[PDB]
């Protein structure tokens, strides 16, 4: 069976079939490699991440071969040619419906540049199969084998990742977290625009002297500041905040490839009553109590609340954080926002990622908004 995690982004594509916006497109960059080198590595993950080559059946997994992947392979005269092979293919690929139930849900385009060490790679995933963290698991194992080395044993599957979920749910510890969860949600219970605006010097230290001095993660003071801002302009008291977690909740989870994506809501209080510091102590708690429960899925959450008499709940916002052979590894953003609001923090400093549903955002109301949370941030430090 597909777990959780896999379930609710094949169950929402079956709900829109020719909804693309699941498909994930990941561009890898490579220099010092031949190209039947790359080929060769890219056969051998295939072979080993089973995510990357299973069918569905209205809902079953059923593996695949690994050489039922389609891998095309491409020669550039130059450079500008290459670029022209990779837009084509982004376009191409991000057009495409997957058809789940019958192909392996992955896709591989090779382009090689004639008298060039580089070589450009794009795979296109359907998102039941993959996430964030795959793509950097995908990335590093590719580079080990590029360079010669050798891959450990993996400790897990996705299908034994199911396994465990299916008995943590019959044994119903999920659920008690769930409605402990839901106690306190209860009252709570498209075209986008897209900016990536770098985070101010001063802003970066201000939030790592903020977090230091009062013992919680710079991230719950970036959270605070953009619940705090946001909460202000909708003039709420409360405000329900998704927060994305990578879902690999063990040790064993840490290196497979697969969909394990998990969204939890949390409520910031925006009483004046509290402190700052409070108010961020609360946020930093909440937030690392995710964290500990990350395996408890969304669906737990809302069953939950359904028991207590609501119809579900509404979560509109949401943020989160993301020698040898030369390997970059970038998704290529997916248009679109189902969320009316998103805020992704990425690693270099830091890069604020805004995505904004069009019918309330521009462009420039997302500058505006970006700069009024700094200067909120600012302010509480
Ligand atoms: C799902 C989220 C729904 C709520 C969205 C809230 C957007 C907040 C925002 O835009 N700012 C804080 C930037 C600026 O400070 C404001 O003065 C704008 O100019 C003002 O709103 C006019 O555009």
Not at 177 to 189: D, I, K
Not at 196 to 208: G, Y
Not at 322 to 331: C, I, L, N, P, S
């Given at each position: 069976?597909?777990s959780?995690?896999e ?29 039947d080198?790359?080929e ?15 069918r ?15 891998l ?17 293919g ?12 019958h192909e ?47 891959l450990?044993?993996?400790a897990?599957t ?5 396994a465990?979920?299916?008995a ?8 008690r ?13 498209r ?26 993660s ?22 329900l ?5 990578a ?7 840490q ?29 930093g ?13 969304l ?22 954080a ?10 290529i ?31 420039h109301?997302i500058?505006?908004?970006?700069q ?7 302010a509480?430090?």
């Open positions: 069976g597909l959780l995690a379930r609710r982004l094949w169950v929402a594509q079956q709900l829109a079939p020719e909804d693309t916006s699941y498909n994930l497109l990941a561009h890898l960059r490579i220099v010092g490699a031949t190209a080198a790359i060769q590595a890219l056969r051998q993950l295939l072979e080993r991440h089973v995510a990357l080559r299973r569905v059946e209205t809902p079953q997994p059923h593996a695949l071969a690994a050489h039922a992947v389609p095309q392979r491409l020669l550039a005269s130059d450079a500008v040619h290459a670029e022209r092979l990779l837009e084509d982004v376009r191409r690929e991000g057009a495409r419906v997957f058809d789940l139930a392996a849900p992955a896709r591989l385009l090779l382009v090689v540049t004639r008298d060039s060490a580089r070589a450009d790679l794009l795979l296109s995933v359907h998102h039941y199969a993959f996430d964030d963290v795959s793509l950097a698991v995908f990335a590093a194992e590719l580079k080990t084998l590029l360079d010669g080395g050798r450990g044993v993996l897990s996705p299908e034994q990742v199911a465990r979920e299916r943590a749910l019959a044994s119903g510890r999920l659920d977290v769930a409605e402990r969860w839901a106690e306190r949600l209860l009252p709570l219970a075209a986008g625009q897209r900016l990536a605006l770098p985070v101010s010097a001063a802003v970066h230290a201000a939030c790592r002297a903020l977090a230091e001095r009062t013992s919680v710079p991230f719950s003071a970036a959270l605070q500041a953009f619940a705090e801002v946001l909460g202000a302009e909708l003039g709420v008291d409360d405000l905040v998704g927060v994305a977690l879902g690999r909740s063990r040790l064993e989870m290196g497979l490839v697969g969909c394990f994506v998990n969204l939890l809501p949390l409520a910031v209080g925006l009483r004046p009553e509290q402190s700052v510091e409070w108010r961020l102590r609360q946020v708690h909440d937030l690392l109590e995710l964290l500990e429960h990350q395996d408890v899925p669906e737990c959450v809302t069953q939950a609340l359904r028991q207590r008499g609501a119809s579900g709940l509404p979560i509109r916002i949401a943020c989160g993301h020698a040898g052979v030369r390997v970059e590894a970038d998704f953003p997916v248009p679109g926002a189902r969320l009316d609001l998103t805020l992704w923090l990425e690693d270099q400093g830091w890069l604020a990622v805004w995505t904004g549903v069009s019918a309330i955002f521009d462009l109301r500058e505006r908004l970006h009024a949370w700094e200067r909120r941030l600012l509480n430090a």
